[PDB]
Structures are given as C-alpha cells and as structure tokens.
Write a protein that binds this ligand. Sequence first.
Ligand SMILES: Nc1nc2c(ncn2[C@@H]2O[C@H](COP(=O)(O)OP(=O)(O)O)[C@@H](O)[C@H]2O)c(=O)[nH]1
Ligand SMILES: [Cl-]
Length: 160
Amino acid sequence: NVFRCNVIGVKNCGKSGVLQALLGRNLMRQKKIRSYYAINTVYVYGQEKYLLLHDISESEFLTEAEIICDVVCLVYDVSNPKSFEYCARIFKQHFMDSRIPCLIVAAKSDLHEVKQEYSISPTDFCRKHKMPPPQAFTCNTADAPSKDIFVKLTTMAMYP
Ligand SMILES: Nc1nc2c(ncn2[C@@H]2O[C@H](COP(=O)(O)OP(=O)(O)O)[C@@H](O)[C@H]2O)c(=O)[nH]1
Ligand SMILES: [Cl-]
C-alpha cells in the first residue's frame, strides 16, 4: 500500500534533504543536482510499503488539500532557533485536532544544536501531546542517509 506524508518546516530547514534521503542520496550528491514529492519502497515488519513524501512550503496557513495525509513530518532545524516555533504553530493550527499522527524530526543533527526560541522545548512538546520523542536526522553522511525515520513514519501512517 501507498502512504502519504506531509513534510512541514521553515525555509531552508532541510525539507528537500529529507525527500532526497528517501531516494538514498546524501547531502553531497544533492548539491550536485539542479520535485516537491518523493516516493520509495519502505519495509515494515518484512512487508513492502510505499512512502510518498510531500514537500510543504513555508506559509501562513495550510489549505484542506495540504492537510490531508496519513502522517505528518514536522521538521525543524537544530541550528535555526526559530525553526521549531513554526512546527508548533502549524501543528496547533491544522493537526492538533485532526487525529493525524505527527512526528517531530530534528534535522541537520550534524550541526551544532542551539536553544530554540519557543516557550516549550521540542522534547517537552512531544511529551505534552502524546507524540514520539524528537527524531534526530541528518542527510550529510558518507553513505546513504539512515532510513530510520522513514520506517517510523510509514509505521505511524498505517494507523487506521
Ligand atoms: N549540515 C547539513 N546541512 C543540510 C542538511 N540538510 C540540508 N542542509 C543544507 O540546508 C540548506 C537548505 O536545505 P533545504 O534542503 O533546501 O531545505 P528546504 O528549503 O526547507 O527544502 C542547503 O543548502 C543544504 O546544504 C543536513 O542534514 N546537514
Ligand atoms: Cl519552504
């Protein structure tokens, strides 16, 4: 089965990097490339699934067409202290009452982590809203980026 995931975060938070990481391309190969969607096979419990990622550009609000999905990937940049505030805002605005599972991903984990300019820490925010702990991620690797978050996203997408 095919599952859809909306990747949401500020400009230059690493959304495009997440999509290309699904395609198995590290940051090194990405920067030598001149879509807002990405799909690949993801295996959960030995079974073949398809995960379709949607790059959602930073905006004031999301339309009903942008909201519908099987799982939401809230991406913030650990080197950008204003990145998580957007994720929290979008969540409360569209997904807090949607019964759609959300996963907060701390992208660019290879960089130095700074204090986010939000009243609630990303860790506390996840605990407050029954969400999994913030998932560390980076596509700036020697080999292909880890597909751990994609297995987890697909797993959550299989919720009824
Ligand atoms: N160090 C590091 N830099 C990254 C990573 N992912 C993206 N970047 C850099 O962040 C910049 C913008 O990221 P981008 O993928 O365009 O995010 P987007 O605009 O939200 O889709 C690019 O110049 C990338 O080189 C990462 O995992 N590690
Ligand atoms: Cl954007």
